[PDB]
């Protein structure tokens, strides 16, 4: 429920 994870571009990554 509601929302949790890390997105990955190019060579960095962030949460939310």
Do not use: M
């Amino acid at each position: 429920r509601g929302g949790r994870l890390c997105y990955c571009r190019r060579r960095f990554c962030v949460c939310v």
